[PDB]
Each structure stands twice: as structure tokens, then as C-alpha cells.
């Protein structure tokens, strides 16, 4: 199934981190992440 | 208690230290490029850091 999953950067709980600026993906030992402005 | 009480330290402690391990920028590590070195590090997903 799908769902959709808040998170809140803060501590070592969530660590919020740019993309590759040359891949453009996150890297390993990382999944991706949205942000709205 | 002041000639026996100096200790600096403050000394790295392996390759499963904090510092390493979750790095800032104030502290610089590194190794030479294209050797075996390298090519540990790279190999392991756990060292991607």
C-alpha cells in the first residue's frame, strides 16, 4: 500500500540534506524526501 | 592534583568514532587518492559517509 508520511527535520531523528548536485538523486543510506515553499 | 589531573586527550579513537563517523566541517579527514585506501571505503555502503 501507499501512504503519505510527515516528517520535521530536528536531531539526529531527521537529518535534512540536498540532493547530488551532480546526479541529482538522493545518495545511499538515505531515502528521498519532499519540501513545499 | 594539578601535576597528575593534566590530560588533555581529547584523541581519536578508531574508524567508529562520532567525529568520523558523523563528520562537521571544523574537522578534516581524508586519505590518498587512488589507493587502497580509497577502495575500502567506497566498497562499504556502511562508510558512504
Given amino acids: ?37 | 592534583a594539578f601535576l597528575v589531573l593534566d590530560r588533555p586527550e581529547e584523541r581519536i579513537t578508531g574508524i567508529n568514532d562520532p567525529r568520523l563517523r558523523n563528520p562537521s566541517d571544523k574537522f578534516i579527514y581524508a586519505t590518498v587518492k587512488q589507493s587502497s585506501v580509497d577502495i575500502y571505503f567506497r566498497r562499504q555502503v556502511e562508510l558512504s559517509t
Fill in chain 1, 1 to 37: 500500500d501507499h501512504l503519505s508520511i510527515v516528517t520535521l527535520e530536528e536531531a539526529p531523528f531527521v537529518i535534512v540534506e540536498s540532493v547530488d548536485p551532480l546526479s541529482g538523486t538522493c545518495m545511499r543510506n538515505t531515502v528521498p524526501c519532499q519540501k513545499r515553499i
